[PDB]
Amino acid sequence: FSRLDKVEAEVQIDRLITGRLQSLQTYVTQQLIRAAEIRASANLAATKM
Amino acid sequence: VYADSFVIRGDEVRQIAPGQTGNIADYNYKLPDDFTGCVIAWNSNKLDS
Numbered sequence: 001f002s003r004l005d006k007v008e009a010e011v012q013i014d015r016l017i018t019g020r021l022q023s024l025q026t027y028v029t030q031q032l033i034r035a036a037e038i039r040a041s042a043n044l045a046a047t048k049m
Numbered sequence: 050v051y052a053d054s055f056v057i058r059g060d061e062v063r064q065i066a067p068g069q070t071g072n073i074a075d076y077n078y079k080l081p082d083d084f085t086g087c088v089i090a091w092n093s094n095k096l097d098s
Contacts, residue, residue: 007066
């Protein structure tokens with residue numbers, strides 16, 4: 001903000017907030033996939049025991 | 050609708066735009082960041098001068 005005009009500084013941060021938020025989405029979707037496999041492997045152990 | 054009239058030099062026309070930093074736009078008059086509308090400027094050398 002200290003090197004660019006505040007009238008259109010929203011444009012550059014918009015390219016930044018979207019990119020930052022988008023990567024947070026990718027990490028969450030990875031956890032959903034992993035949790036499904038663990039739950040599948042948890043029930044198999046719960047059946048063996 | 051709002052109308053504001055004044056007479057300015059040719060070297061300080063640009064400072065009316067929002068986000069402009071300068072002498073006339075800091076101590077006399079300036080527009081907010083979310084300004085809506087526009088201005089019309091034309092020579093008055095025939096009459097005002």
